[PDB]
Amino acid sequence: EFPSATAKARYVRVSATKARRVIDLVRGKSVEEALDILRWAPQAASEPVAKVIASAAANAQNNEGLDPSTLVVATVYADEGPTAKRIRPRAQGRAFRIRKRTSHITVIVESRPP
Template sequence: MKARRVVDLVRGKRVEDALAILKFAPQAASEPVAKVVASAAANAENNLGLNPSTLVISTAYVDEGATMKRFQPRAQGRAFRIRKRTSHITIEVESIPAAGGAATRNRRKGGAK
């Protein structure tokens, strides 16, 4: 999964805009990234009481996860190693107040995978 390319598309954008971008992105990694963005927004709304229309993706990055190693049988008794790679997706959202408001920062972390 090339999740870093997808996360680069939504970094710094409003949550509503990011979900719209991810909905129509052709990459396979856009679905799990959209789930993490939606989860981070829901956590900010339910746990911190933030307005979902003011949420902006402040920090977004992808780290390497566990690698599952498998073998594929080949000709003449050989075996090739297959690496099934995973990744940890982290999304942080913060609330941007309306124009002219005080500059306060509220952060909420999203989950991994």
């Protein structure tokens, strides 16, 4: 098994789907390429995703003593976390529900020999 390091960004104030939109971009790529794509991705969800990927890389470097250049985004996924319920008033005094969703973005970077 490849030496892996984990990083979970929990309760991120972004939808699980909107985090997944960029996690799909940077799943499978090396850590460096993933961070570059998340740097130049126009989606705002790329910033928490980039931060959690970089945290996984930092854990691999410091807590695990792995070579940062050999790291790769092995398994990354955003699960949906808690959802706050808000009320938006609409016409005729009718209250519609608004969902302030969060996401847990889990990242596991492995150190693979190219």
